[PDB]
Amino acid sequence: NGLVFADRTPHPALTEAKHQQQFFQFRLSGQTIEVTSEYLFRHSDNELLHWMVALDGKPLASGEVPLDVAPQGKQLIELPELPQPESAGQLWLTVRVVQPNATAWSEAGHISAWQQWRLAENLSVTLPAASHAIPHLTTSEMDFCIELGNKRWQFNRQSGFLSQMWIGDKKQLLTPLRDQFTRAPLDNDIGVSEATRIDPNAWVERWKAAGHYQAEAALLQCTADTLADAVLITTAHAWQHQGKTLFISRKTYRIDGSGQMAITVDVEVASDTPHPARIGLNCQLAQVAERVNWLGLGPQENYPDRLTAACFDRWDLPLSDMYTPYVFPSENGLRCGTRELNYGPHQWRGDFQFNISRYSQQQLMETSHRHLLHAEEGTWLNIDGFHMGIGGDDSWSPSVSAEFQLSAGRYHYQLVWCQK
Amino acid sequence: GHYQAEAALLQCTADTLADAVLITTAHAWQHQGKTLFISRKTYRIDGSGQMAITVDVEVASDTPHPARIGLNCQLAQVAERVNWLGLGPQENYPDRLTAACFDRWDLPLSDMYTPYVFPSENGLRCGTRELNYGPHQWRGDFQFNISRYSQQQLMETSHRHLLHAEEGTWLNIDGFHMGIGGDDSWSPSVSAEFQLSAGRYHYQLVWCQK
Numbered sequence: 001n002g003l004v005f006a007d008r009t010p011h012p013a014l015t016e017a018k019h020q021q022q023f024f025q026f027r028l029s030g031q032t033i034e035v036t037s038e039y040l041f042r043h044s045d046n047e048l049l050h051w052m053v054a055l056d057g058k059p060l061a062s063g064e065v066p067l068d069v070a071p072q073g074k075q076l077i078e079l080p081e082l083p084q085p086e087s088a089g090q091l092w093l094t095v096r097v098v099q100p101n102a103t104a105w106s107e108a109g110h111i112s113a114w115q116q117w118r119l120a121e122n123l124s125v126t127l128p129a130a131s132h133a134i135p136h137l138t139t140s141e142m143d144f145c146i147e148l149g150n151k152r153w154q155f156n157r158q159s160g161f162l163s164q165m166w167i168g169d170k171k172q173l174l175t176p177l178r179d180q181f182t183r184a185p186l187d188n189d190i191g192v193s194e195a196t197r198i199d200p201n202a203w204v205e206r207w208k209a210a211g212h213y214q215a216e217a218a219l220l221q222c223t224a225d226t227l228a229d230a231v232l233i234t235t236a237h238a239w240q241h242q243g244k245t246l247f248i249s250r251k252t253y254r255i256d257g258s259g260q261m262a263i264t265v266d267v268e269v270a271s272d273t274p275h276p277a278r279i280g281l282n283c284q285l286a287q288v289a290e291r292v293n294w295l296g297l298g299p300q301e302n303y304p305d306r307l308t309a310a311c312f313d314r315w316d317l318p319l320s321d322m323y324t325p326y327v328f329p330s331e332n333g334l335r336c337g338t339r340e341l342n343y344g345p346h347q348w349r350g351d352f353q354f355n356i357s358r359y360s361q362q363q364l365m366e367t368s369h370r371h372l373l374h375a376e377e378g379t380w381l382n383i384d385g386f387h388m389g390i391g392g393d394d395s396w397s398p399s400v401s402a403e404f405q406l407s408a409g410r411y412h413y414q415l416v417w418c419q420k
Numbered sequence: 421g422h423y424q425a426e427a428a429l430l431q432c433t434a435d436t437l438a439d440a441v442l443i444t445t446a447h448a449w450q451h452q453g454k455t456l457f458i459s460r461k462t463y464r465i466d467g468s469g470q471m472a473i474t475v476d477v478e479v480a481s482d483t484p485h486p487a488r489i490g491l492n493c494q495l496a497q498v499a500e501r502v503n504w505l506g507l508g509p510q511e512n513y514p515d516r517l518t519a520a521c522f523d524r525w526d527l528p529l530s531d532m533y534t535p536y537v538f539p540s541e542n543g544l545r546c547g548t549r550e551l552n553y554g555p556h557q558w559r560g561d562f563q564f565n566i567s568r569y570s571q572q573q574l575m576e577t578s579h580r581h582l583l584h585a586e587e588g589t590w591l592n593i594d595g596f597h598m599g600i601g602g603d604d605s606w607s608p609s610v611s612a613e614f615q616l617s618a619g620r621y622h623y624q625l626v627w628c629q630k
């Protein structure tokens with residue numbers, strides 16, 4: 001039940017505790033930062049404030065101001081009028097309180113508090129320079145093949161999914177790109193439930209009994225169209241369990257001249273089915289790469305009801321760090337509010353949540369101990385428009401708060417998949 | 421500048437499909453060089469006369485959250501009755517809708533107008549899946565008001581008795597609408613969870629004849 005492993009390696013939840021338990025509070029108003037001390041006895045005499053402004057990851061300004069705050073007191077810090085941003089994007093402000101001198105309990109340079117705000121945002125209005133290339137639609141009884149130069153997209157007409165992609169003669173997928181509404185159950189999803197003594201109120205059991213894990217996709221529609229400068233693929237699927245429709249998924253794929261695939265997804269969720277664990281897509285990628293790069297919340301694991309500690313910046317970690325090694329394996333390694341993701345030859349743009357690793361949701365839920373896991377061929381990807389909270393007020397009864405349950409009935413998300 | 425903002429056209433293309441015609445548009449609302457709103461739409465007209473409209477709006481994070489995200493027009497038709505499947509039968513808003521019930525409702529046009537002595541936005545009905553007026557039918561998941569008075573007349577006139585009915589019927593169909601508040605009437609009182617602050621909004625509508 002610990003915040004740390006038995007060998008004292010931190011769980012991701014330790015960072016969330018550090019941030020919420022901070023001793024300095026911050027408000028922003030125009031160009032003024034207000035800092036409040038929550039110390040009862042000491043002055044801030046080993047503290048200074050580092051601030052920085054970045055446009056979509058790229059720094060534009062930074063600076064330092066010594067902190068001089070009495071117990072329970074306030075200090076007003078006025079930012080210099082900041083250089084105007086050139087292009088489009090959202091400006092972000094980050095502050096951190098740094099301890100310059102070593103103590104009996106910390107190293108010099110130790111970070112004790114932090115906070116972020118959105119500043120000015122300029123929206124992209126200018127039409128991206130209209131390219132000339134034009135994608136080529138090839139139709140057979142079993143498939144739709146889209147070709148742009150030497151890039152190839154294959155849609156299966158029987159199953160209704162993007163079943164393979166090609167750059168030249170190099171294939172990208174080991175498993176087709178499909179919808180996903182399930183996660184490998186966390187301890188909070190399971191609670192005190194067991195094979196010998198089932199607890200029907202637990203999230204895992206409501207999910208099992210409704211047939212979420214056994215749901216079979218059934219194609220409703222699958223059409224292909226040529227436009228002026230692109231090809232459009234329209235699909236619709238029903239997920240059913242023994243006659244009862246659980247979810248309907250409606251998608252458009254738009255592949256244009258610049259070689260980008262715009263995916264638009266619209267999902268309906270039956271009001272009387274237990275709210276699903278996630279609403280997204282998954283596939284098994286052929287490529288295994290070293291690093292993972294993203295513009296979003298990080299660097300550590302973060303979930304919708306546990307993402308306050310994470311900051312919005314540009315992050316770059318090795319693949320093995322995007323997986324959290326819980327002793328009892330479960331869904332893990334998510335990062336939220338991501339605008340861009342980069343892995344090997346692939347780039348994904350939008351506003352989504354993701355995890356990425358060598359283990360599939362199926363392997364994670366079938367294995368009881370972490371040492372028993374084996375890396376699978378390629379890399380398993382999950383990209384969710386929406387993901388249920390993880391809870392934790394206790395681990396023996398539903399604890400996910402109402403504002404974190406996927407309960408809206410109708411959902412929308414869009415992604416762009418291209419090459420970097 | 422929300423009231424003074426002018427729609428600038430970014431894109432407007434047409435494509436013929438196997439069974440339909442698809443119109444794509446994009447607009448940007450600006451004031452003194454700042455982009456407030458961007459609206460991206462597709463209209464799809466299929467073989468059965470139905471028009472499917474898809475809208476995606478971006479709102480600038482540093483502009484004050486908008487009062488509504490929707491569409492308007494002035495219809496030529498003046499009909500006796502309004503018929504809808506949604507919350508009703510009385511006026512209801514996102515932070516004042518619990519009393520309303522979901523069902524099929526049917527009222528004379530004049531009932532779709534609340535005669536507040538000082539005139540303002542009035543008459544909204546929320547959580548609607550279907551609206552009927554004359555030979556028109558709208559389907560989706562939206563909020564609406566319908567009346568003989570433009571938002572503009574309503575905002576320029578000070579006493580209800582000084583209002584005059586306009587030719588035809590003004591229709592407002594919103595994907596989203598800001599709460600009304602009222603914990604008091606002398607400071608901002610709309611609670612955070614009823615402000616339109618998500619930055620990106622999506623809604624869809626089918627328009628047909630019946």
Ligand code: NA
Pocket residue numbers: 538539540574575576577578
């Ligand atoms: Na008025």
